[PDB]
Structures are given as C-alpha cells and as structure tokens.
Amino acid sequence: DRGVQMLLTTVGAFAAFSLMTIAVGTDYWLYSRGVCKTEEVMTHSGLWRTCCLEGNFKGLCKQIDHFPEDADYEADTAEYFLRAVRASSIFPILSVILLFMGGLCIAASEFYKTRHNIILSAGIFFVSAGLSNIIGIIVYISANAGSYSYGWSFYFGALSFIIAEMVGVLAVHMFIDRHKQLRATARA
Amino acid sequence: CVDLAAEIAKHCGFKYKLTIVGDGKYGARDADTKIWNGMVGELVYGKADIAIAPLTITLVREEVIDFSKPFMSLGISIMIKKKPGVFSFLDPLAY
Amino acid sequence: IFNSLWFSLGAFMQQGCDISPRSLSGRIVGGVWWFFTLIIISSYTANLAAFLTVERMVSPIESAEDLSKQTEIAYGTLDSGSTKEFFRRSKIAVFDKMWTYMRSAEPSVFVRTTAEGVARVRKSKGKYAYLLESTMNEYIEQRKPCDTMKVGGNLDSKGYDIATPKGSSLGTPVNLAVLKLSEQGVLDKLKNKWWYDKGECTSALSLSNVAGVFYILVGGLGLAMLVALIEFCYKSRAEAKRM
Amino acid sequence: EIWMCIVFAYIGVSVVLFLVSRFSPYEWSTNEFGIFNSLWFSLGAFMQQGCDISPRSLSGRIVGGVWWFFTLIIISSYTANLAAFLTVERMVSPIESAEDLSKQTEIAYGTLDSGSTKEFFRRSKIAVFDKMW
Amino acid sequence: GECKEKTSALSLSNVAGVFYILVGGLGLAMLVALIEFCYKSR
Amino acid sequence: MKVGGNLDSKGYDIATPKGSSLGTPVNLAVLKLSEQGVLDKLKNKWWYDK
Amino acid sequence: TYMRSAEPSVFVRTTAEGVARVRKSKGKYAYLLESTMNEYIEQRKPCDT
C-alpha cells in the first residue's frame, strides 16, 4: 500500500543516515598495529584519528598524519590528489550531506502533495549518496593500501550504502506510481 | 663502549679516564718506517693502558697487543634500498 | 548512426546485442570487427597474465650467491679497508668471482668513504648494493629515514675484543670479565638496547590495481544520470510551454 | 576488498540503470527495465552471459557501456591473476624469527632440558627474550 | 670477464596486422554496398 | 630447515692447558687457516659438500 | 658431492652398462665419459643418445 511504502521509505532513509553518520564519526573502521602518540601495539583507526588498544598508551587517540612529508617526497600528482581526497574525507561527508538532503526532501513531500517532482529529487539524492559512499570506500581502501581487519564501523557504512540504495529504488517507484495516478485520473 | 667500560672498570674496581685518539685512526702497520700510529700505536708506546673500542681482532694486532675474547661477533653484510598508478589496468597495451 | 555505435561498443565488450546486421556489407563489417575484438581482448588478457607472472617470479636478493649471479643491481665495497683485501684472498667460487666484477667495471663502484656510499645507496632506488660489516649495518638500518635494510647472513666471521698491551696486569681480569658479561646477559642486553631501544624505526590483486576501472564506472554512472535529468528537464519544459 | 566492491558496484549499477530507464514519465512502459530486470541485466553483463534485453536510451546505454568495460577489465584481471598463481608456486614459512615465535602461540617450541641454551634465557633483559621466557 | 622472462606493453607493431585486416574489410564492405546500390539503380 | 637468526653469540675454540707453550702456535695456526679460508672450506666440506 | 651420498650408487663398473642404464632410465640418468668415444655411440642404433 501507499502508507506502508511511505513509512518504509522514511524508516530506511533515517536508518541509512544514522548508520552513515555513525560510521563517519566512529573510529572502528580498521584494526591495525601502529605507533602510539607519535612502540608497536594493536590499534583501531577511523577517518580522522586512531586510538590504541591493550597497550601502555591505551585509550588516547592521535590524529593520523595523512601527509607523510618526513622524507619530503612528492612522486606523481595522482598520489597527491588521492592523499588530498582521503585526508579531507570529502566523499563520505558528501554522502551524509546527500542522505540528509534526500531525507529532508522526503519529509517535505508531505507538505507539498501536488508537486510530484520533489520525490524524484529524493530518489536522485539517495542514488547519488550511495554512489558517493562507494567512491569513498574505494578511495579509503586505496589510501590504506598505499595483517588488518575491518571493524563494525566500516561495515556500518557498507550497510548504509545498501539501505540508501534500497530506499532510492522505493522513492523512484513512488514517482512512477504518482505519474500513473495523475494520468489515470486525467484519463477518466 | 663507555657502558661496557663502566662494567669492566666496576668489575676490576679501578678508575678510568676516557680520551680520544688524536689522529682518529684504528691503526695499521707502515712498511716504510715500521712505526705504528693511531689506536694500535697508543698501547704499544705506553700512551694507553687499555683499549675498549671496536677493534677488529686481526693477526697483525694480536701478535703484539693482547686481545681478549671477542665480545661481539660480526661479518660482511649487504645493504640495499628497501604503488601502482590509478590507470594501471591499461598497462598491457600501449597508448 | 546511434544504433551502429551501440552495436560496435557491445561487440568490442563481447557482450550481448539486441540487434545484428542483416545485409552483406553490414555483416562483413560485423565479422571483421568481431575478429579484431577477439584478437585485441585475448592480447590484453595474455599480456596482463604475462605481467603478473613475471612480477610473481621476481625473487628479491637475500644472500650473496643469488646476488652474485645477477648483474642488474650493481655493488661495491669501500676504496680501502680489509673488505677489499678479504675478497682478493678469498678463493670461494662465490667470492673469487665477487672480486672479478668491480675489477672490470665502469664506473668505479668503489667509494671513498662509508658515508658517501650509504648516501648514494638511498638515491640508487635499489640499483646499487653496499657491502659493510654486520654490526654497524643494523645501526644505519635503524637510522632515519629507515630506507636501507640488512639482508642475508654474514659472509665471513670477525670479532671485536678488548685490546691490552702484552704483559699487563689487566690482561686476564678483563678476559674473565668479558666472558662474565657475555654469560650474564648484560653485554647482550646492552647490545640489544642501543641498536633497537634507541632505534628510530601480497599475492592477490589489490583494489589499488583496479581502482581506475571503478572510478571510470562511477563517473560513467554520474554522467548517465546527468544526461537523464537534462533530457527529462528539456522534455518537461518543452511540453509545458506547448500546453 | 575487490569482491566486496564488485558486489557494491553491481548493486549500484543495477539501481542506476533502473532509475535512468523508468524514471522519466515521457518514456511510457516502452522498456522492460524494472528493478528485477535491471538486476538480471547487470548480473548477466558481469558473467558475460548476455540477456534478452538491452538499454535503448542514451543514459541507459552509457550505463551499460561503462558496466561492460568494468566487467571486461575485472574478468581479465581475475583470469590473469589466477594464471600467475598457478604458474608460480610461492611457499612462505609461518614463522620467520624468534620474535614472531613469541607473538604466536599455536606452535610450541623449547630447548634442552639441561644445557647452555636453557641457562642462557633466564638472565636475558631483552624485551623479546624476556617475554617468551 | 666484463660480461628471457621479460614483459612489456604491447606496441602497435604487434597488432598492426589486425588493424590492416579491419580496414580492408571496411573497404570491401563499402565496395560491395556501392556495387549493390549501382546494380539496383540500373 | 634453519629459520630466523642467532639470538646469542658464541664461539668454538681449541682448548689448551693454562700456560701451555703449544697453545700459542695452535691459536696462531688457527688464524692462518681463517685468513686463507681453510677453516671455512673445512666447514663446507663437513656441512655443505658432504 | 653427489655419488658419495646417493642411494642407489650411480657408479657403473663398465662403460657399456652405463650407456644401457641411460637407455633404460628414459632420460632420468646421465653418464660422464670421454667426448670422442661418446660421439661414436650417438651415431649407432637406435640413436637414442
């Protein structure tokens, strides 16, 4: 039905936004061993800083130096571009921005029933948020590559992409139904 | 060596004075004058009473200067210098 | 013209096509394009396999003999010292040929001083190898910027001992003390402390190898979405004005 | 990571193709690209098995083209890497140093019940040599 | 004495023949289509 | 097989009576074989070649 | 360093048997012998060496 579909869309959008916001803010993205407060000790790292685990310096988080200018090496401009993208975390942040925009537009869909084009904008925003989350995952993994494990915070972003993409399908399916309703009413 | 010298001095219970060889040479045999300089010559001529330094135990220095058992073993080693492009999937074919 | 480009793209990507040429000339074009596509795709796959196999076959130098056989990476000792004299007197098949390379080698790989030899190793990017003692090798390995690494075992055996003038009262007490320190672990502990405590320092294809294809895919998805919205807006504004 | 990103890219491509195929109210459906059919098309494209349908719009065709290029590169890379793995046999010892032995606990190790080796390790200040003692 | 398993990017000389065959086939197709059109016109 | 490295350093030598005159030529002759490579050659023939 | 430590021993009492050992080992065994007289063998039947 229409009401259950709208409720499911709202719940999915809220869940995706919450999951992606938690994943961006939380530090349990990658489990790896690294030097604390720059000895070797197992730590967990997020997007901005890493906190050491079961060590002498357990509990304090130190900001990851995204630019390793210790050797003053530049190599190619592509490496600098990728490093700048990873450091700013532009793509996960723009993914949460797009998710928030889509959710707010879905909420505003109730205010304006006649204007049907906005739910299409919500679907577009959800699809773009999913694509940007994928780009961010690819960039993050590539930067990390240049033993480890992925924590639940990283999988929260992965689950957020699936939920947001499922909602984008549902939102677009509504715009199809809305135009079918308009044409069917005009036909009769 | 200084911490090693401290243990040696502490074990034998004698005061030690740390100095530096003026020419900064480990010491080698000279064919022209047969006069030893550097680290090896300091002990022979009485300028030093004991040498605690990375001195290689060789035949030339052994036959005049008494060498203790090697406290550190070494040998000749090798020193060497210890990210794919984004479009590295087009590498197999030329541009 | 639009459908022809689509058929050609689908044929090159070796994917299904909704349409196929029916005339003689159209089928000739399709057949030659299919042969070209098959050859090119097989060539790409074969060359990538050769690249990966050759990379996997690359064995890094570990010991002297494997390094001795190859000649791609140059190496040399100091301009003086017992390192050169050891090579001349050595008659081992690994070591007799060792001397024979820098003797006939241009430019001269001999280095005036150790510091310059280490410095030229960093800029060599692995092209040059330096042969020094084992004890101080680890120290430079532990020095910044931590780009050099000691590999393999010691070629020969040497040692450092306390030097005492002959017929001195400090002869035997130091020798006993040297043995005492080694057997007490203090000498061993002191050796480990300064080198390390004071120190200043796969097979599967990774996502970095194929990140460009992901970037191109998502860029194409974004471009297609942009085109879809542009055409939708144009069509909507075309009919709204007409109505 | 490549497999995970392959699954994610497949889902994203299916959703984007379904969106660009059936969102426009001025294309009615002329095409058969629902969400289920878009998933089927993307799965068939990845496995190089083809399908009974093909996108007919410019945007859908762009999506199909980039997905086909991605699939070609990925499948060729998989085949090439499997060939490299089968051609060259690499064996790496699980333990390469005494420090690694201390880090692990699965493989047991010991020395003489009475000898110099056993008597050496008691008075060892080394952090590596003290932890595994 | 002072004195293979190599790999390199495939160059155009390695696959120039297939390009020649492709262009020849395009020319043959064009010629056949023109011949058919001329025959139908006559 | 041998893996890792030697954590401790030891030596293996010829024992002679304390103050025995023959000991000094023995140690010197031990050195002579070391520089000429006779010692390591004997090491290989009883460890590697055999 | 091979035939001293190898089971079975690769020593052959006579030249003729050593060639026959090679002719039986389908190429897994080799023989060392004088070059000129060996060249005489490879020109004889069945020319398998």
Residue numbers in the entry:
A (entry chain F): 5 to 42, 55 to 162, 173 to 214
B (entry chain C): 425 to 506, 511 to 523
C (entry chain C): 573 to 773, 784 to 825
D (entry chain B): 524 to 551, 567 to 671
E (entry chain D): 771 to 773, 781 to 819
F (entry chain B): 721 to 770
G (entry chain A): 672 to 720
Copied sentences from the primary study:
AMPA glutamate receptors (AMPARs) are ion channel tetramers that mediate the majority of fast excitatory synaptic transmission. They are composed of four subunits (GluA1–GluA4); the GluA2 subunit dominates AMPAR function throughout the forebrain.
We next determined cryo-EM structures of the GluA2–TARPγ2 receptor under two different pH conditions in an apo state (in the absence of l-glutamate). To protonate the receptor, we lowered the pH with citrate buffer immediately before vitrification (to pH ~5.5). Our cryo-EM structures reveal that protons lead to stark conformational changes throughout the GluA2–TARPγ2 complex that are most pronounced in the NTD tier. When comparing the LBD sector between the two pH conditions, we noticed greater conformational heterogeneity of the LBDs at pH 5.5 versus pH 8.0, which is reflected in the local resolution maps of the consensus refinement. Atomic models derived from the consensus refinements reveal differences in the LBD tier between the average LBD structures at pH 5.5 and pH 8.0, with larger displacements of the BD LBDs versus the AC LBDs in the pH 5.5 receptor. These lead to an approximation of the LBD upper (D1) lobes between the BD subunits at pH 5.5 and to rearrangements of their G helices (inset), which mark LBD conformations in different states of the gating cycle. While protons also target the LBD tier directly, as evident from strong, pH-dependent changes in GluA2delNTD desensitization, the lack of NTD BD contacts amplifies conformational rearrangements in the LBD and TMD sectors that are associated with desensitization. Taken together, protonation induces multiple changes throughout the receptor assembly, including rupture of the NTD tier, rearrangements of the LBD pairs and rotational movements of the TARPs, culminating in reduced charge transfer through the receptor channel.
